[PDB]
Scaffold this active site. Structure first.
Site, mmCIF file in Angstrom:
data_model
loop_
_atom_site.group_PDB
_atom_site.id
_atom_site.type_symbol
_atom_site.label_atom_id
_atom_site.label_comp_id
_atom_site.label_asym_id
_atom_site.label_seq_id
_atom_site.Cartn_x
_atom_site.Cartn_y
_atom_site.Cartn_z
ATOM 1 N N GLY C 148 0.608 -0.992 -0.016
ATOM 2 C CA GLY C 148 0.166 -0.126 -0.277
ATOM 3 C C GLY C 148 0.761 1.365 0.083
ATOM 4 O O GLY C 148 2.271 1.339 0.508
ATOM 5 N N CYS C 149 0.574 2.257 0.041
ATOM 6 C CA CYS C 149 1.417 3.849 -0.207
ATOM 7 C C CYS C 149 1.253 4.181 0.491
ATOM 8 O O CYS C 149 3.008 4.629 1.444
ATOM 9 C CB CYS C 149 -0.122 5.325 -1.423
ATOM 10 S SG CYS C 149 -1.917 4.752 -0.871
ATOM 11 N N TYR C 150 0.728 4.101 2.405
ATOM 12 C CA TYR C 150 1.282 4.428 3.621
ATOM 13 C C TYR C 150 1.972 3.485 3.861
ATOM 14 O O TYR C 150 3.114 4.529 4.520
ATOM 15 C CB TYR C 150 -0.107 4.461 4.224
ATOM 16 C CG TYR C 150 -1.424 5.632 3.748
ATOM 17 C CD1 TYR C 150 -0.564 7.351 4.453
ATOM 18 C CD2 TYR C 150 -2.832 6.096 3.191
ATOM 19 C CE1 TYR C 150 -1.605 8.248 3.925
ATOM 20 C CE2 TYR C 150 -3.538 7.022 3.155
ATOM 21 C CZ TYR C 150 -2.698 8.304 3.323
ATOM 22 O OH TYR C 150 -3.821 9.372 3.159
ATOM 23 N N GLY C 317 4.514 4.700 -3.904
ATOM 24 C CA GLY C 317 3.283 4.559 -2.722
ATOM 25 C C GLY C 317 2.427 3.327 -4.052
ATOM 26 O O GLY C 317 1.113 2.886 -3.143
#
Lengths: 345, 345, 345, 345
Positions: C148-150, C317
């Site tokens: 995922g990006c986060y 991300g």
């Protein structure tokens, strides 16, 4: 790399773009960078986004031997470029992004730029860098005066039409728009985030300096003096430019003819895309790219047509075209380092 | 507060603006609000920013009783306004914010909307709500069709100029710009922050539903049919609008005449302001208020003038003017509750 | 070109990013793409900014011949990825951008996504695509779950620090931000320009699916179950992503130790830059590039430190990291087609 | 109408805001205004949006007599206020929006400000303007120190919570976000639209002038030295502010208690609003007006909770509270002239 690049006035946005574009250019390489107040500073402390690159230190124009490189990109302010360029080595192919050589009329330069033309002589050997139109002269030019952003969206679509006598030369009204990046990086109150966004406003009403540049090019092709209106607007966006062009078609001419002339004039040109009749171009789609999308529409007024032309004012409207020209001037493929895809969304 | 107000179609941006505007209105109180799929819900549920005030539960227009209502702001979705209004109790002051009662010519309405008009007779008693212009008719009108946003910015400066023959009525070209709030709150792909942010587009080219509303007015004052070339442009911002207008002055007429004419027509008007010579207005300066600023400049083309008119598309371009009308349509000072000053920055 | 690319679900920003990233890629050249909701249509009709490219017409998944492609990028809609992938042909390197193969514990997959894992066994051969940390396994994996990006912004600086026991795994407080492009192109009210512009707000408070993904990676190193606090925020901007991380330093450790560890751990890493102490990162500086910047600072609270990690959520991300993983899976230069300079301004 | 109000430091956005707010204040009218650096100019010439307002021409503090006005708002630059407020007639009620009177401890002033304090004694009769918390002291007070922006959004939730011993005063970590309007109108490169737009940034890391202000407020409540972690973040937006607050509840305390407690404290408050559990506030909810929202959320970390508070940094985050404080210093209703409704969208 094989080619050493001289970049004058590298601390501005067009300078930054010159650095970005040359980064994926397998042939050219920035080896000399000039700055004024930020001299004696790593461009990292100027434009941290360029940190992945390892560039020279910024020096002043006074401290720089131009025998250092092969070609020069000049991104200095208008009125400071003429005496500098004239004093540069003769064996230097040059591409100044400034407006100090775009106008052939010496007197015209003075009335619009408020001071005598310094390189009156050099002027006559300068070629206007509108690539898709003057490619042949650009190829063998020593000094090229990269065009202004706005004038770029105007001539590309209008030149071929006027050349084919598909539109009249009178009553051409231009309503243009540009992101605030066109205002430069000067620390001015008027350009703060709080003085640009959530509202729009016109500027340069009537006497805008891009007028003579526009009228010159159109006059050349119309072989007659062309007088127009040009009312640019400032957008609460950073990148992008569009000109909504209202023209009168020539007697018996229909939008279909304008569309065909444009489609035929740019069918094999990588950077100029003629959209299908009716399709509306968005500056969002050329953002961060060197492309120009244009489309033709009928005016609700008989005989009139509406032309829309968009670009990323910093690329095709600035450093992207400049690189496009230096490419061919040095004998490299025109699109080298210019095939970045739009950053949409 | 003695005036009980009914808002039909409160879940949109016009409805919200009405509620916001009336919140501090000294004599008008919202006592009835209707929504289609929101019936049964509170307003705070739909628009949580309105949570500081007590508002009535959202009911269906079909089950609404106007027994204790004294005036109507209709913001129903284009398609049901025509019939719903006809069947409303006849004995009030209905300010219609939809476009359905705007066109006096049934045929034009049919043409520009494809669908047949459903209240042909009632259409005959409707008055156009461009306050500063039709003030005297509006004060005693039954049903008022509140003008569209763009049309307000276009007719205000032009009607006076046409009534005085200072500008020709042909070849009037309008290059208009608007924030996306005018695209309502519908959940569509082209309205997401990502799609809209940065960049502008020319939507509704050649033909747009505001054309007939624009020409109508102009034509009624020129005593002759007017055919313009109007063009919407979406701005990456929420509020504000500008219709940069290009006109041909009348023989012998100079920018000063147009300037003095407008200067005299709205001289004592609280909302229409004429700026000094050469002063460029900004939408930023009227954002959040009901004020329209206008300015006149000479065009570079001999005999042509350029006019700029800006408003907050949602206020003077809608809910604000609607309330400005309901005020008189009730016997109150035309500025009651409309003194909100621009929210700049 | 050497490798033929198969993109499934090219009608979204992820797919557009894949197509943009692969445009100037010398070895991989898209030749197959799926988008059921728009099969048969042209790519230009979905993403007109790609018009300079010649891509295969969109198709349906059930129609695409997965034997014609050597590598595939999967953007299937969450919930439909497992079945399609699990049944994908044998010979094929696969990178899924979905979160459906990230979690190495089927039990957690259900309690956080409300549905059973439909590809249990296959899940076992999947390697988490956090490149700089799991490169070794990535090169020899046939199926990679792109992170995922986060989670990327968090694990990158925290994994190395946890490695050397420089920080406690208790009370790690994360406060992250991403441009709205992370919400996708779905047509919903919440993401309307008028709803998002000029404001912020948290979302996914307390619980959020990226949580288990973040903890899993950190748990790997801490060799103990890590429980964090992770709070997302929606920024009024399209691209970009930062993470502000608050950590406790282990006994005897100073901020300089965390800095040195990070500088040492990523000194050779191309896409992960550790800024000098006291220098603050800006998502503006890693916008439109595969580049990542991080920095560490002391917390005013004795014993604590601050770790800011920034990235372009659409790049490292998401798709950027996706491709970084495929490059090495196919044994190509890991930086190929990923050295795009940041777009600034 | 009755009270005559002057305005010292009528140059920055806070000055323009005070005027906006008083533009329709039923009992307070601006009769005086200072702007030394721009004396001899019309307020409009500085802020065109205020054109509709008939305002006093800007006068120099030197040329300004404070016997005509009954109260004074002070928006002077930091380091210049102490000397001016030093020589004012006690017959004046004063509200200073600077930092010069916020902290009672003189030493702390000098350490966090680089210069000596110049009003020791007077500082002893200064009340902190957090209206809903110190209202009674503010009423029976002459001089008032108007709280900073961030400090307001933080002390409102925390003070009542610390007072009821519901949260521990250790490890209070605050991640705040603010629109760029709060930096002011100063001509700084960093705050240009092209540099700010489409990206966020952290600033004041570890040390920021609001730190001592925040801690003094919290320490006075908890009756102990409170050291917090506070990290501001600059948002690419004009107005709005959020301070996401991470705290640790007291032994045996549940988020229900914090939430329920905030209810008691602000039960009859017009300006502060405690949202229902689970509802996430948005800076869009109070933007433009003088409102703030805040609730309590459970943290994923043991005995922790996540509080969010939002405000428009220019109104309740500046000139709005100042007026809230003055209204009660003059005996008028606290909400007088501050019932402006949020401009949403």
């Amino acid at each position: 790399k094989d080619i050493r690049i001289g970049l004058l006035g590298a601390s501005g946005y067009t300078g930054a773009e010159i650095v970005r574009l040359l980064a994926n250019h397998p042939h050219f390489q920035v080896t000399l960078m000039t700055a004024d107040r930020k001299a004696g500073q790593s461009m990292e402390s100027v434009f941290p986004h360029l940190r992945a690159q390892k560039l020279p230190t910024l020096v002043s124009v006074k401290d720089a031997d131009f025998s250092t490189v092969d070609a020069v990109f000049c991104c200095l302010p208008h009125g400071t470029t003429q005496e500098i360029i004239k004093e540069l080595p003769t064996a230097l192919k040059i591409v100044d992004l400034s407006a100090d050589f775009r106008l052939r009329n010496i007197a015209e330069y003075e009335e619009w730029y408020g001071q005598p033309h310094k390189a009156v002589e050099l002027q006559k050997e300068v070629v206007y860098g509108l690539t898709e139109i003057l490619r042949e002269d650009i190829k063998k030019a020593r000094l090229v005066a990269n065009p202004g952003c706005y004038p770029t969206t105007i001539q590309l679509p209008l030149v071929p039409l006027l050349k084919a006598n598909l539109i009249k030369h009178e009553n051409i009204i231009i309503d243009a728009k540009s992101g605030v990046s066109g205002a430069g990086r000067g620390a001015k109150e008027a350009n703060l985030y709080s003085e640009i966004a959530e509202g729009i406003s016109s500027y340069g009403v009537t006497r805008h300096r891009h007028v003579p540049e526009i009228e010159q090019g159109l006059s050349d092709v119309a072989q007659s003096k062309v007088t127009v209106s040009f009312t640019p607007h400032l957008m609460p966006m950073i990148r992008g430019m569009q000109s909504t062009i209202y023209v009168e078609m020539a007697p018996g001419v229909r939008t279909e003819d304008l569309h065909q002339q444009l489609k035929t004039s740019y069918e094999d040109e990588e950077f100029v895309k003629v959209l299908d009749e009716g399709v509306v171009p968005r500056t969002h789609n050329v953002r961060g790219s060197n492309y120009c999308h244009m489309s033709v529409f009928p005016d609700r007024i008989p005989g009139r047509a509406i032309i829309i032309s968009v670009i990323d004012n910093l690329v095709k409207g600035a450093s992207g075209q400049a690189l496009q020209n230096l490419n061919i001037m040095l004998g490299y493929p025109e699109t080298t380092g210019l095939l970045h895809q739009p950053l949409f969304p």
